[PDB]
Structures are given as C-alpha cells and as structure tokens.
Amino acid sequence: DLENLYFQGSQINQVRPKLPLLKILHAAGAQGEMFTVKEVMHYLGQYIMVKQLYDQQEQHMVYCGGDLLGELLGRQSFSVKDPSPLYDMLRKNLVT
Ligand SMILES: COc1ccc(C2=N[C@@H](c3ccc(Cl)cc3)[C@@H](c3ccc(Cl)cc3)N2C(=O)N2CCNC(=O)C2)c(OC(C)C)c1
Numbered sequence: 001d002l003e004n005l006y007f008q009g010s011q012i013n014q015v016r017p018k019l020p021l022l023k024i025l026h027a028a029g030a031q032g033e034m035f036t037v038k039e040v041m042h043y044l045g046q047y048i049m050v051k052q053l054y055d056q057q058e059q060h061m062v063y064c065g066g067d068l069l070g071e072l073l074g075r076q077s078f079s080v081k082d083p084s085p086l087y088d089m090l091r092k093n094l095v096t
Contacts, residue, residue, distance in 0.1 A: 012036060015094035020072055027051075040094065044069075044086075 014034050017025055022033055025040065028047035035043075047069065048054055048062055055061040062069075065076030072093060073085045 013096070015096055017038065018093045018095065020068060020091075021093040024069055024072070037090070037094065040090065 012046040013036065015037055016022075016033055017035065017040065021040075022074060024047050025035065028043040030043045031038070044052065048064075051067060051069075053062050053064055053067060053069065060080045061077060063077050063082065064070030064073055070076060073089050075085050078085050
C-alpha cells in the first residue's frame with residue numbers, strides 16, 4: 001500500500017517551536033517541546049487570553065506590541081479575522 005508508506009511517520013505531523021515561541025507556549029501552560037500545530041494554536045490563544053492582549057471592546061483585535069508575541073509577529077496589532085502575520089510567524093518558528 002503506497003498510501004500507507006507515504007503517511008508512515010507523517011500522520012500526526014509534530015513540530016518543535018523555536019525557543020522564543022516555545023517560551024510563549026510554556027507561559028500559556030504548555031509542557032515539553034514537541035507539539036501538534038493544533039496544540040500550538042490552542043496555547044497561542046490561551047496566551048493572548050491570560051496576558052489580556054485582546055481589546056475588551058473588539059475581542060478579535062490583539063494588541064501584541066511590546067510583548068514577546070508582537071516581537072515574534074513583527075506587529076503592534078493584528079485582527080484574528082486577518083491572520084496573515086500569524087501564518088508567516090508559524091512558517092518561520094515551527095520546525096518539522
Ligand atoms: C471575536 O473574538 C475572537 C474570536 C476568535 C478568536 C480565535 N480565533 C482563533 C484563530 C485565529 C486565527 C487563526 Cl490563524 C487560527 C485560530 C483562536 C486564536 C488562536 C491563536 C491566536 Cl494567535 C489568535 C487566536 N481564537 C481564540 O483563541 N479564541 C476563540 C474564541 N474566543 C476565545 O476566547 C479564544 C479570538 O481569539 C483571541 C485569542 C483574540 C477572539
């Protein structure tokens with residue numbers, strides 16, 4: 001079965017965050033240094049909620065500037081409805 005052969009070792013697709021991103025995930029309660037991409041997105045959401053980086057009046061807006069997360073994103077702000085900076089950052093900071 002060639003489909004099985006292809007998918008062996010790549011059915012979970014674990015990643016290792018680079019050290020600055022790993023520090024953010026730990027701050028959100030993550031343990032260890034290997035995650036699924038879904039786990040990474042969970043801990044990033046949780047980080048923004050516990051650091052109170054979102055706008056109470058406009059909850060889709062994150063004000064990450066002068067936080068480590070804003071350094072990693074290269075942004076002062078982003079809307080979750082326009083998440084291009086997050087895609088760019090995870091492309092750069094998640095190692096298979
Ligand atoms: C209307 O208010 C919303 C609507 C959606 C989100 C959101 N949307 C989810 C989401 C957004 C973009 C992508 Cl690419 C993936 C997931 C996910 C999330 C995950 C990682 C990051 Cl860095 C930011 C947000 N994510 C969340 O983390 N949410 C889900 C809903 N409410 C929450 O308390 C947490 C949201 O996130 C805050 C953390 C800003 C606020």
